[PDB]
Amino acid sequence: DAVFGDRVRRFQEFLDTFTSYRDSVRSIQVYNSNNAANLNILPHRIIISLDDLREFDRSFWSGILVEPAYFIPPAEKALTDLADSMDDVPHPNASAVSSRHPWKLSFKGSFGAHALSPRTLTAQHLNKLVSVEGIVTKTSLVRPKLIRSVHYAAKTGRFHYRDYTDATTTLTTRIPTPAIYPTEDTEGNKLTTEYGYSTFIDHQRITVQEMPEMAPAGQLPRSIDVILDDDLVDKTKPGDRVNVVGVFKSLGAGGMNQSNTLIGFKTLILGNTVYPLHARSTGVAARQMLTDFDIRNINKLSKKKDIFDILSQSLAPSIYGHDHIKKAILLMLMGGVEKNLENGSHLRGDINILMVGDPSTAKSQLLRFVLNTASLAIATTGRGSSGVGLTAAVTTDRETGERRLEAGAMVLADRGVVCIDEFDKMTDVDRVAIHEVMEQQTVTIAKAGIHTTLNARCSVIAAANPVFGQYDVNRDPHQNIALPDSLLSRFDLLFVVTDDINEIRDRSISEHVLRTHRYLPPGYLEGEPVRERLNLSLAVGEDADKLVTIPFLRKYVQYAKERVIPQLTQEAINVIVKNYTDLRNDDNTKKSPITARTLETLIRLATAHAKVRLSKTVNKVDAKVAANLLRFALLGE
Amino acid sequence: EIPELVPVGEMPRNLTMTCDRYLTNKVIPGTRVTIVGIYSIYNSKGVAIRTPYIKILGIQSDVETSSIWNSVTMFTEEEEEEFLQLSRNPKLYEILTNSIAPSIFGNEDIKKAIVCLLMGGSKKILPDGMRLRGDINVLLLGDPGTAKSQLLKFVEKVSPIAVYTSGKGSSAAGLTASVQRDPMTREFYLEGGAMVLADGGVVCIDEFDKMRDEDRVAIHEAMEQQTISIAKAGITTVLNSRT
Amino acid sequence: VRKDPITKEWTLEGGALVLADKGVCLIDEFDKMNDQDRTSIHEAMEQQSISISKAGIVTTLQARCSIIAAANPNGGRYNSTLPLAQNVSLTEPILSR
Amino acid sequence: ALPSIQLPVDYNNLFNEITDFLVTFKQDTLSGPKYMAMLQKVANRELNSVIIDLDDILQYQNEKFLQGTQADDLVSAIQQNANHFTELFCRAIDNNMPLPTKEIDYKDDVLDVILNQRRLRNELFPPNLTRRYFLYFKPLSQNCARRYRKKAISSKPLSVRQIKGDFLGQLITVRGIITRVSDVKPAVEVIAYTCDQCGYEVFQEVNSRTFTPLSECTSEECSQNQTKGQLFMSTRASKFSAFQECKIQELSQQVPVGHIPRSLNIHVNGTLVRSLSPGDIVDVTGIFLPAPYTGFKALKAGLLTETYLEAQFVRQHKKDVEERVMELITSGDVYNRLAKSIAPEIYGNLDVKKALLLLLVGGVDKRRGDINVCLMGDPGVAKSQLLKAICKISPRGVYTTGKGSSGAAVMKDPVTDEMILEGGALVLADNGICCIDEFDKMDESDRTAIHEVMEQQTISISKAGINTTLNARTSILAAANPLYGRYNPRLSPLDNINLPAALLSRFDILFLMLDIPSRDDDEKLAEHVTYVHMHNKQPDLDFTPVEPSKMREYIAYAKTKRPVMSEAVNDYVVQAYIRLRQDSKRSFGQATPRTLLGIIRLSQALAKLRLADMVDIDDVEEALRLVRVSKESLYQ
DNA sequence: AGTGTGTTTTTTTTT
DNA sequence: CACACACT
Ligand SMILES: Nc1ncnc2c1ncn2[C@@H]1O[C@H](COP(=O)(O)OP(=O)(O)OP(O)(O)=S)[C@@H](O)[C@H]1O
Ligand SMILES: Nc1ncnc2c1ncn2[C@@H]1O[C@H](COP(=O)(O)OP(=O)(O)OP(O)(O)=S)[C@@H](O)[C@H]1O
Ligand SMILES: Nc1ncnc2c1ncn2[C@@H]1O[C@H](COP(=O)(O)OP(=O)(O)O)[C@@H](O)[C@H]1O
Ligand SMILES: [Mg+2]
Ligand SMILES: [Mg+2]
Ligand SMILES: [Mg+2]
Ligand SMILES: [Zn+2]
């Protein structure tokens, strides 16, 4: 332990070098204490970048990489003793004091030399801490691990704590032991096992896969499991891009028990710290940041009436025209209020729009633009997905051993904007399933043995081609699209895209494409091949942390969903009802009797229009704008 | 076993091998290799019979094709210099035109279109979320017995970055990528279909008309997006389709 | 291709046209049999090889076989005044190949 | 051999404080001591269990604070680990709370007979065998000033997601609905050993639920002279207890955004066993109890500590004089009141609203009181929001879906390696409420199965061949809507709808809703919605609502006195049926005797609802007015 | 007393 | 890995 003690001393010298860390720990402890007096207790997790401490000690920083299993254990021991000597509030929660709260070490930045990828991970670099960012398909459920056993015979007055770290949490590979709890203890003592004071760490077997696009053609994504034990439990859902900082470790004796003997070795990545980054193009994990500077920004424009049109223009800058369509998709993006009632009847604030368009009307790209604009962005085509699979798969999983719920899109759909393309081609069973589950925004999932009902409230855009190649006015719209009005009425907006062509507009489209094409991508050599590289992003973890820019716009609108919650206002109410007067009984045969749905649709549309204005309540301007756009869409103009 | 050997009426036997750290991952499946390794035997777990396999001491490519081109110029500066010279001489364009489809007797503009398609349209990635679609898919309509399938086969032989197939020969479900149940996992895994293989390659397929239309609809979307988006069976994997 | 429960994987099942390969191929009752099967035969014969990619089996088998189709005229009697295509209940492309 | 860390539990003082509390806790303190009252309950064995109440401990702590004694902070310690405290209570009721010492008539001496032989032929009698009970724990406070009056800090029930490994030691409370309930199974806690030559009766108690046979004898004379003493199973002397384990699903809203709901096992015994049903949403309380594995599971998968999580207390969620309801509904006139107040959001189809009220009670017939409501209605206007309202308010209310692949009586006998019966989707539907969703489009085989079930009030699972008939008369509601969304008034009143005529004719009553742009009622419904906005309660009218519990009592008295129909009613209904048949000859649907039977069922159901049989005539014009309004709605 | 040995229907996918 | 059987 002389080298162990030396590493403890060097880590202490580190803590001395960087006050901010001990300050952060101090802030953590006071956060723990006050919240304890009051919840949401953050764990004893401490985050120190690789680029940190790299300066004062090259040797220690290197040996962390070379032999993490010998560097981090003493480092965390020193972390813990420093914290408990510096928290200075030992008395409260004396029960948990004996159970002990380990202090955990995390990291920031990219190793590069160590941190490359799951596929690039090879045995040549093993027992060394690395980091990889990947998609996780499989997540194992949590199971506590009892490493410190609390057991005691009343007569002894000793309270034996037999602590066992067999395979996972241990780094020294301590010998396996069963923790029998001998009922004789040592001196024939009953040795009652005292529940509580006993450490339990909820274990996770989480396997992470590489990018399909980073994987070369014909190569399946490379998958490797990671372990999380009541320290990093459950930030991430399956199928999310996530960066994990883990050490490459082997277990199972490599399978070389006695003889077959050519079987592979059992290895696995145990990850101390994890940085989830599932945002597209390595963004902010779909979590838009916020600053008071950005807060005060935009707002002054929101007072100006033209801001809504400016936002509409900003959308799909690669597309020409479709300004009303862009306004509609903007209204889509902003989320309406889910009105709740003291019964099973809960009003939906979700926005659902159906659109029919000729092939190559950019609507597919439009759906793609909505995708890359939305946070969740659950999108597919009519042939793209299996309806049951996307809604719910009630098949069992072999590792689980019993019947499992597997909602491909539905559970992914709820609490996020979702998309669907070519719904005419979609399986009719899926169509009738989505029918009335998107109206009620909830699915009973009572199919098969499992009957648990799970909510599915989300905003959906539909882009299905006409039955004929192009919409023919001579044919009825329902002749042009075979999709029944069932839940087709339950689309808050309906859109028809016809690729009719006029010299002025044709020139406009052509010039737009000409500008988009000759334009060399930002920077780069004019004669330079496309790179679309990995960006070699060193920043990992907290290191990663009139026209308007798009991601900035997305951050603003997300901030809006967070903040702006308008309520239906009386003058807006009167405008709405005055419209509805003739809207429900319009003499013109616009087809699709609007009924009671469209009243709620326009309510939501005016609410989101107020959200554009950032007003804490709706305004009649929102109501009349929504009515104007709705009549625009319904007339087909 | 030696696809050229064609043992008549014998199912092709297969043997297991092992590779070392400086031998592993050298070559991909579906590629022929001339191997030099010791004959090897181990017990699988039938009396005194043990698993036959090979421990390899040297790997050589029977197909002889180089590995995944990592831009390392085995053609070196010289061969690419004459390549540019051929590009410098505009007549060589018609040279490539005529050379394609031997014995076709003409159809030169058709061959020019084929050369242009195989040449690969440039995929431009806009600073916007959008991205200009590079590849295109050429449609072959006409009278039968006109070397059309012959020309397709020739073109695929010219460029093996993709694989020649046929509509009926390709599984209707998951043409781009089929979903199959793994023997040791009851979950239906994603098996790479033709356009997974065709991704990154110019692909020729036969009997488009004879193929059932409904799944061919699923092909146009995949080529349009240049990817393959699947959410079937609760699996939301999306794979690129650059073909 | 045949799913093999004993081995637990999909296995190749002997295509009779592969059995035809390397030898003569007899064909009978063909004018009455299934049309999709006829198109499959067209595909197979065009390249003298059968290419199959399904169930994880992407194999392609050479089919070198001299084939002889047996057919009955429409109603069993060919009408010489009638055009052959009208005397034939089958496709034009097959008679071309 | 094992390191030991010292903790300030002060367990013995906890035990003596517990004894002092039990002595000192009164009903007056709750308002003689309550716990010697519990002792005399034990003595005569009036109950089968004695259950510790935390509320009593709360009052004790309050008293000790008044006394100024710290009281060891008993509540916090028992919350942290009560299983050891449970053993302390067992010791106390064995050690310090006295022997019952009360004369009993009978039915307990049989074990006391086993108890009596212990002294002759001579700890020897297990404390659990000594006194028999099931000691549970019932929380002391919730949403009160306790726990510093701050958020959570125990007490507050949490879903499975909020449960953590650190929570294994401490007692917990949980929200949600139990997915399923296991059957009862005897649990052999302590086994009574009987040897052949010696006859000695030694008792060992197994807590691992896995029993290892002793195969030897501890009797001294069997040990000497090497006579083989084998202790055999004397079950009747040994203790048993019914065991039930139940998986509880966390609430959907409790589940995080886009997360798969998690269910955990809950194990019960004694009082609570057999007293639970899966369909209920239960807020139950219990210590957290991790489950030791059978063996070698830990070797392959690490510790992997799982739990069985026995619950000490159970509280099913909400599911007031009975006659007091009658006084209000007489003032309320619940017929009209319920019809409107039941769906204030709908604002329309008031005749349909009246009809649905009668569907709830349904009626009962000696020879069978089935309304057979079919709501073909209008698509995209109602019958989904209109639907499922009765599901929550009425128990056994099921919002079933005819199609949509939402689930139909899919029995799963092969649910486990062993063939154990498992109910399907339709068997869940029962007499309370059966709401069909997406009825118009649905599986034809399911259509035939449901038609046979409803016409027979029986369910046939087959498979093993057994006819497990659990269904009885049940109220049925149809979500069918006209095909294409636009019914044809001119032709095909029955054929414009996907449902077959035989299926249509099977229902006793059928109604049609139709949306028309003729009037400005759009604006009135708009006023209702613009109530629902900035008045997030209801469209304010004279609806006079009936609370579902009050509605439950209204249903309870809706089946009253079994009103025998008057023969004047009999003549009136036969004349009405004759007129209906004659008009049918004149249209699309000929009058059927079963239709007249359904009319009679309507009349008697309304009669026993609030009124009575008597001449019963007036109720018959009420029901037949409903019928003719339905017929006109079909005709329009 | 040697020493050995055992426990973790559905749903697409064909067609 | 490690604990009940069947002799060792
Ligand atoms: N212009 C041509 N020059 C040379 N050979 C030709 C020409 N047209 C047809 N052929 C020959 O005719 C054969 C018939 O074509 P195939 O390779 O069978 O495929 P294909 O032309 O697509 O016919 P289908 O449409 O599939 S029946 C070719 O293989 C050539 O050998
Ligand atoms: N009369 C009404 N009063 C209040 N809300 C109404 C009314 N009619 C329709 N709605 C609204 O529209 C929905 C009610 O229609 P539902 O009963 O859910 O559907 P449906 O009419 O059965 O539709 P299908 O599937 O086309 S038969 C809810 O979201 C209500 O808010
Ligand atoms: N108005 C437009 N401006 C720019 N590009 C357009 C426009 N309309 C169509 N396109 C182009 O059409 C192509 C195909 O569009 P796509 O999204 O597949 O069409 P659809 O609307 O039928 O789904 C894309 O390259 C897209 O940029
Ligand atoms: Mg499209
Ligand atoms: Mg061809
Ligand atoms: Mg409904
Ligand atoms: Zn004995």
Side-chain angles (χ1 to χ4, degrees), chain B residues 15 19 25 40 45 48 51 57 70 87 106 115 143 174 181-182 238:
Chain B
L15 277 296
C19 296
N25 321 114
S40 314
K45 274 72 64 180
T51 304
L57 271 296
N70 319 119
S87 81
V115 171
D143 309 333
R181 186 258 183 192
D182 203 84
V238 174

Side-chain angles (χ1 to χ4, degrees), chain A residues 266-277 279-280 282-283 285-286 288-429 431-504:
Chain A
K266 179 63 187 69
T267 78
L268 189 149
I269 291 288
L270 77 166
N272 68 337
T273 186
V274 178
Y275 171 57
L277 173 53
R280 59 189 67 91
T282 72
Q288 319 287 279
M289 301 335 307
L290 58 93
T291 69
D292 196 10
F293 173 72
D294 302 341
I295 284 160
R296 58 150 284 283
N297 297 318
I298 303 96
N299 306 339
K300 65 185 75 64
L301 288 80
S302 76
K303 281 81 177 174
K304 322 168 195 197
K305 58 190 178 297
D306 55 356
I307 184 53
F308 171 77
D309 287 330
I310 300 300
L311 306 180
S312 176
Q313 304 154 359
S314 56
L315 315 179
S318 57
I319 211 169
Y320 204 112
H322 328 292
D323 177 72
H324 186 278
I325 294 89
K326 295 189 286 289
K327 299 189 289 184
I329 71 169
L330 188 69
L331 184 62
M332 190 45 108
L333 297 149
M334 187 66 204
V337 168
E338 316 299 323
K339 303 300 292 295
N340 301 257
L341 315 170
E342 274 304 325
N343 51 8
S345 295
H346 156 78
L347 301 186
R348 70 176 194 82
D350 294 329
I351 302 92
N352 312 317
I353 302 184
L354 185 141
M355 182 278 288
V356 56
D358 313 350
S360 179
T361 43
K363 101 217 213 291
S364 290
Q365 341 283 146
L366 287 196
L367 258 62
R368 260 77 60 84
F369 195 96
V370 163
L371 186 152
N372 47 68
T373 300
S375 64
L376 274 79
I378 313 306
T380 186
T381 60
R383 292 296 97 203
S385 176
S386 73
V388 179
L390 65 87
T391 42
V394 193
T395 190
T396 179
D397 191 81
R398 293 184 67 185
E399 173 66 75
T400 67
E402 59 271 4
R403 178 166 289 167
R404 289 279 78 69
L405 291 176
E406 308 160 0
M410 183 278 288
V411 70
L412 276 298
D414 187 347
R415 292 271 55 64
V417 176
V418 309
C419 314
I420 182 63
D421 192 50
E422 298 304 325
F423 196 71
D424 47 343
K425 281 80 177 175
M426 187 66 204
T427 80
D428 209 357
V429 57
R431 304 194 274 212
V432 305
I434 283 164
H435 171 282
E436 203 65 45
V437 71
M438 295 299 102
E439 184 163 357
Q440 77 192 351
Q441 299 296 345
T442 55
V443 58
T444 185
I445 301 169
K447 194 264 179 195
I450 298 169
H451 298 58
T452 300
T453 293
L454 191 146
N455 59 6
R457 63 190 195 285
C458 67
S459 295
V460 66
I461 182 65
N465 278 353
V467 170
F468 319 97
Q470 284 67 241
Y471 173 89
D472 178 34
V473 193
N474 308 115
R475 317 287 77 71
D476 284 303
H478 197 265
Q479 288 171 337
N480 283 279
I481 188 65
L483 298 175
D485 204 2
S486 69
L487 193 84
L488 169 64
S489 44
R490 273 83 70 190
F491 275 98
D492 304 318
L493 285 86
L494 277 296
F495 265 77
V496 172
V497 168
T498 64
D499 201 76
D500 185 76
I501 61 171
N502 177 10
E503 180 60 63
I504 308 297

Side-chain angles (χ1 to χ4, degrees), chain D residues 125-147 150-155 157-165 167-182 184-215 217-256 258-326:
Chain D
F125 208 70
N128 295 318
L129 285 191
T130 306
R131 75 285 175 277
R132 282 80 62 194
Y133 63 92
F134 314 106
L135 188 151
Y136 299 156
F137 293 147
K138 315 180 296 292
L140 57 93
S141 169
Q142 186 69 269
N143 299 115
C144 302
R146 295 282 78 78
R147 313 312 98 189
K150 300 308 290 185
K151 208 40 181 175
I153 310 155
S154 190
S155 180
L158 318 176
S159 88
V160 188
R161 293 299 209 277
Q162 293 81 17
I163 310 305
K164 266 80 186 173
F167 301 159
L168 267 58
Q170 48 270 44
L171 186 151
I172 60 177
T173 313
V174 64
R175 304 295 285 267
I177 172 168
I178 56 174
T179 78
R180 57 171 178 74
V181 168
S182 67
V184 309
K185 280 87 179 181
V188 296
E189 314 92 315
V190 54
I191 190 67
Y193 281 147
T194 298
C195 186
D196 48 353
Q197 68 264 10
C198 76
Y200 274 58
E201 305 303 309
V202 294
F203 301 73
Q204 84 89 30
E205 184 161 1
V206 58
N207 316 302
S208 175
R209 282 81 61 194
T210 53
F211 166 68
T212 312
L214 78 171
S215 72
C217 192
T218 78
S219 177
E220 64 279 17
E221 64 87 20
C222 285
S223 300
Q224 282 100 32
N225 65 7
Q226 311 286 261
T227 180
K228 178 57 188 69
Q230 212 290 333
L231 276 294
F232 309 106
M233 295 299 102
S234 57
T235 57
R236 53 184 293 276
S238 315
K239 185 178 265 197
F240 312 100
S241 292
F243 198 90
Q244 265 183 344
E245 53 280 14
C246 308
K247 297 292 295 189
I248 171 165
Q249 195 39 264
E250 48 197 359
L251 298 181
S252 195
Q253 48 84 24
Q254 281 187 299
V255 177
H259 288 69
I260 297 173
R262 202 184 304 263
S263 182
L264 194 40
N265 50 7
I266 305 293
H267 298 49
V268 301
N269 287 283
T271 45
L272 274 298
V273 66
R274 193 98 77 176
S275 75
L276 273 301
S277 171
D280 53 26
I281 304 93
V282 287
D283 185 355
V284 308
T285 313
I287 302 167
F288 202 115
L289 286 88
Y293 275 117
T294 310
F296 177 73
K297 267 67 75 180
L299 303 195
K300 287 301 293 295
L303 301 152
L304 199 70
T305 72
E306 87 286 14
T307 175
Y308 45 100
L309 187 39
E310 302 208 357
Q312 271 66 26
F313 176 60
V314 163
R315 191 266 176 187
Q316 61 87 31
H317 289 74
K318 278 79 66 178
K319 278 173 280 289
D320 60 351
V321 172
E322 196 85 20
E323 286 75 3
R324 185 268 319 150
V325 170
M326 295 298 102

Side-chain angles (χ1 to χ4, degrees), chain C residues 1-12 14-97:
Chain C
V1 291
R2 48 179 169 78
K3 179 66 177 179
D4 202 7
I6 182 61
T7 63
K8 280 78 68 179
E9 74 271 15
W10 272 93
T11 310
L12 173 77
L17 195 63
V18 176
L19 313 176
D21 168 275
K22 188 54 59 187
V24 61
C25 173
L26 301 187
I27 297 169
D28 184 64
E29 297 181 70
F30 186 85
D31 62 316
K32 319 300 199 206
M33 61 80 71
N34 315 298
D35 174 51
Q36 84 289 6
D37 300 334
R38 298 200 277 125
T39 46
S40 76
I41 309 313
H42 308 152
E43 186 275 337
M45 61 79 70
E46 292 294 328
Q47 317 92 26
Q48 298 291 317
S49 58
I50 178 60
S51 309
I52 185 62
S53 68
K54 60 179 181 143
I57 299 101
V58 73
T59 193
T60 290
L61 273 298
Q62 166 64 63
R64 56 189 68 255
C65 63
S66 58
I67 78 160
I68 301 95
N72 290 277
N74 299 343
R77 291 287 187 92
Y78 184 102
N79 175 27
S80 184
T81 70
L82 191 66
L84 74 164
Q86 315 193 8
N87 275 307
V88 172
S89 55
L90 282 74
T91 80
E92 163 63 38
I94 181 170
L95 61 83
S96 67
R97 50 191 60 105

Side-chain angles (χ1 to χ4, degrees), chain D residues 383-384 387 399 436-438 479:
Chain D
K383 309 188 296 292
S384 313
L387 199 48
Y399 177 49
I436 311 168
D437 185 5
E438 306 283 85

